[PDB]
Design a protein around this nucleic acid. Structure first.
Lengths: 55, 104, 57, 221, 99, 91
RNA sequence: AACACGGGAAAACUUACCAAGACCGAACAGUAGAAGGAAUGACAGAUUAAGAGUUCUUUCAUGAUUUAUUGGGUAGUGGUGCAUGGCCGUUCUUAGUUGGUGGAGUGAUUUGUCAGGUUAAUUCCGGUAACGAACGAGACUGAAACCUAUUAAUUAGUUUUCUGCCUAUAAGACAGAAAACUUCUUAAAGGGACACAUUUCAAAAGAAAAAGGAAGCAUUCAGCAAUAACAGGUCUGUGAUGCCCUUAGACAUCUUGGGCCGCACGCGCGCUACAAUGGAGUUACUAGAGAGUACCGAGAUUGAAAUAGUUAAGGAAAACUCAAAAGAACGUACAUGACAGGGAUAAAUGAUUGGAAUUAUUUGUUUUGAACGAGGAAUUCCUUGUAAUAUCGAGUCAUUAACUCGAGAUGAAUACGUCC
């Protein structure tokens, strides 16, 4: 088959199965509180979400 | 449990005489801090208990004399120490210390 | 504790307009400042009331 | 034939019933941030100018505060139902609890995202960057804004990048008052040569009340 | 016995809602138990400021705050809070849990 | 590309009946509606985008498509709806 | 302002590198051909690591979903941060910056923005060709230090009552009920310090004791933090992005294996030690802040030497899980000896996670017993609940912390200085 071998590897553990929601990145993932928004992308939308820059 | 600190906790009794506590029964509950910190908390609780009791059921001049005797020995017997732990800051392993800097 | 010009100018203006109300006590001057002036900050009011008493001394 | 075993559900975690208090509010912000961006890329020609996600116990009312309702004046029901249908497909929304409202903002000048889109239009049209910002900043000032600032960085003067800042009115740069009075938006526009960054921050007035720190305004008797 | 709990990210909002339920509870309700203030939850996230690894290692602190209030009524199961919405403000969730 | 012609109708008939269907940019998973790889639905629609039949707005790795006036006409030509199939704003 | 930094603790993916193998992720449009088959998938033998029909043989299934063609797009963790956006760092944590009118100068420019004093501060008193302002500082926001005054009482606590059990000289303890209560706890609104007030010092801004107070360095620690700039880092976070490169024998994409861990050496960030202010054996202990489900955190019972196994409540959580060790106490134990300090290096074996553990993922058992006797030239961080010491939680996390971000535990010495 021309495509029966395409994407045949099992990606269930998670370093290539988890991604950023908007950035689609595989590095610097913030999985806390189910954000899934990886780094460099949570900081842009932090004030929209509700995390205010307090101490 | 820390036996070396027992006479420190008992020192409110001896500062004014055990007879000031002879007719008094206490029931202290300690639920925080370490072990030495709890020793100072109990010292405050015992000294304050005599002062508050003599204010409510005894005249004032006894209370003022008792609190004066506490104050002339150690002020922290009746007032809490306000010192608290400082927040850790990034770039260092503690409140003020910082990680070593390498140049070359 | 050198006071900023915002506190000092406000202290001067209130004295010129409402001298009879103010007295040599810091505590009574606190409530009158909340009355004869509008401030959203408690710390600013005390600083103004603190300087007013010193000025009228 | 594809031997694919995984699936990516088109769900929204705000729809979940048994969810932790910590996770619920975080998922509230994530949905709002994504929903705001999604219809930002759809209503670019309409000037969406903000969203609201208030609910009514079991149904969610998504309100769009568009500053130009021209495309949605009557629009029979095309875009409103098209957008709502889009919400169904992306987030798996049941129909009976979803509805969309469109609202106008009378303070068109005081909305920074709408003004930033105005600058992007004129620049892409071909208007000089000095004439585009000057005209839009005039509209912001008389609308009631205490002050405004437009920052434009890019390849305006040639291959060497150059940034310029346009200033007007009164603006506070430091303090918490920059969290109560500020209103900002960042846009980027592409030309045949490169990307130009557009940053518009409008300092508001007592409408977001709070009466910033330095103020005495002693009454007279 | 009926139990109400309101949670939001804004402290000023729940105090308004807590007062409203207590004021509304004069009629169609017998008593208004004082708002039990469950301890606040803080959701801290600390992140590096730089999209790359260059520069001084500076981090930034974010925190969400969750305010939880608990109300208890007697009322009736049929009447409960009746309208129970009052066009509730965005970001402030009310749920009613009876036994 | 090479997809089951029975399936091709499923996207076309569902898109017409709603005006919009979305997909993820994750090609390792299957669509949760049609139960087929996201690659097949993605490339059945981008080809239809070059007909000026939809708009290919992308957001947060999720692609969105919206039926156009040319989309309505082309869909009728292929799937052979009756000429009264000009509902608009509903399906 | 590079070197536990890319939140970079890479077994496959991550992955950008290497060895192979296929593969289009060739849209759109024209032509050829073709629904009487354009094409695609395939059992078995051989080829192949391969259960890639990839290919040779063989006919069996499905059906314009498109094969070959030309124009053209698209895609790339490809190049260019000396083409950009955005973000960050730095000059720079200190106090600095400006234009309106007016004055001076042919002009670049200057004054305002100063003599002196004072302040953490162009902060103020004063002075004045300057007057009137704007930004920064301050003011502002979060945490801590207080409320026997207020509002509250569950999922926090105390008290009382009933039953039940147990020891005392005489009070209580525990279990299991159940009702008021609000000092503690929780968390809202207000209040509370402004150096006001005394003494002294400098008519003033102000400074130093001392007392009072929960709090008197701006009370402490942080957040935000101006003008101008670097062609400082990232186009490998982005479907933010210009130009260039490759574009069906691919630098696109997929599959298997390896490498990113490779060792003659040199440097940086750290962990553990060189013991008796100790190691080892037993016993009682005492926090705060975290986190948790359509399989996540896991109570309790059992199997047993340990890892871990078989069954298994409650918990979307002040409700259940979740628990401290440094230190302390007990003995005719160890006695200054690389010794029982040190636990690297190797060995034979038991299990966990995983599709996969060899180049040991992690870990148990028994044995092995190496340097290391306080460290040269040099050099780093720190002023009070601070350093230092040992630990707990969280990020990453199928499995893996000596890393980072936080939290509490015990609590030094040394200044109150000066520009070397």
């Amino acid at each position: 088959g021309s495509y029966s071998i395409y994407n045949a590897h099992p990606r269930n553990y998670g370093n290539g199965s988890r991604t950023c929601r908007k950035c689609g990145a595989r590095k610097g993932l913030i999985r806390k509180y189910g954000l899934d928004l990886c780094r460099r992308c949570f900081r842009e939308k932090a004030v929209e979400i509700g995390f205010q820059k307090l101490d | 449990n820390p036996p070396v600190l027992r006479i420190k906790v008992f020192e409110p009794l001896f500062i004014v005489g055990k007879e000031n506590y002879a007719k008094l029964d206490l029931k202290i509950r300690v639920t925080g801090g370490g072990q030495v910190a709890q020793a100072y908390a109990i010292r405050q609780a015992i000294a304050k208990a005599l002062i508050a009791y003599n204010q409510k059921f005894v005249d004032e001049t006894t209370k003022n004399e008792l609190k004066a005797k506490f104050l002339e020995y150690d002020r922290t017997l009746l007032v809490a120490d306000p010192r608290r732990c400082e927040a850790k800051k990034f770039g260092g392993p503690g409140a003020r210390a910082k990680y070593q800097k390498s140049y070359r | 504790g050198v006071r900023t010009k915002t506190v000092k100018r406000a202290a001067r203006n209130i004295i010129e307009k409402y001298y009879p109300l103010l007295t040599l006590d810091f505590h009574t001057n606190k409530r009158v400042v909340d009355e004869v002036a509008v401030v959203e900050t408690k710390r600013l009011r005390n600083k103004i009331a603190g300087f007013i008493t010193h000025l009228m001394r | 034939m594809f031997c694919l075993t995984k699936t990516k559900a088109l769900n929204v975690d705000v729809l979940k019933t048994n969810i932790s208090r910590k996770h619920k509010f975080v998922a509230d912000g994530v949905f709002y941030a994504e929903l705001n961006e999604l219809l930002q890329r759809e209503l670019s020609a309409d000037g969406y100018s903000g969203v609201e996600v208030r609910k009514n116990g079991s149904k969610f009312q998504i309100i769009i505060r568009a500053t130009r309702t021209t495309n949605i004046i009557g629009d029979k029901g095309r875009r409103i139902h098209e957008l709502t249908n889009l919400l169904i497909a992306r987030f798996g929304f049941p129909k009976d609890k979803i509805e969309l409202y469109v609202e106008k903002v009378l303070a068109r000048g005081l909305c920074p995202v709408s003004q930033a889109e105005s600058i992007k239009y004129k620049i892409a049209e071909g208007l000089p960057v000095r004439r585009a910002v000057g005209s839009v900043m005039r509209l912001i000032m008389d609308s009631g804004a205490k002050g405004c600032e437009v920052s434009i960085s890019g390849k305006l003067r040639g291959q060497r990048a150059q940034g310029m800042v346009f200033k007007e009115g009164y603006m506070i740069k430091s303090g918490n008052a920059t969290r109560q009075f500020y209103s900002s938006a960042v846009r980027c526009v592409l030309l045949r040569m490169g990307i130009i960054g557009i940053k518009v921050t409008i300092m508001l007035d007592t409408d977001p009340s709070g009466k910033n720190g330095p103020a005495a305004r002693i009454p007279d008797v | 016995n009926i139990t109400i709990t309101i949670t939001s990210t804004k402290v000023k909002a729940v105090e308004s809602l807590c007062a409203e339920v207590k004021e509304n509870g004069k009629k169609k309700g017998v008593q208004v138990k004082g708002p039990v203030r469950i301890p606040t939850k803080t959701l801290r996230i600390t992140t590096r400021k730089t999209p790359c690894g260059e520069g001084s290692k500076t981090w930034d602190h974010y925190q969400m705050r969750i305010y939880k209030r608990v109300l208890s009524m007697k009322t009736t199961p049929e009447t409960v809070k009746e309208i129970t919405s009052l066009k509730v403000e965005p970001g402030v969730e009310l749920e009613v849990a009876m036994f | 590309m090479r997809i089951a012609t029975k399936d091709i109708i499923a996207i076309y008939k569902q898109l017409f009946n709603d005006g919009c269907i979305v997909c993820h940019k994750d090609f390792v998973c299957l669509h949760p509606v049609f139960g087929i790889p996201n690659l097949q639905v993605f490339m059945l629609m981008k080809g239809l985008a070059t007909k000026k039949c939809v708009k290919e707005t992308c957001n947060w790795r999720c692609l969105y498509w919206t039926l156009n006036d040319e989309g309505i006409a082309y869909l009728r030509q292929k799937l052979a709806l009756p000429e009264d199939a000009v509902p608009s704003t509903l399906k």
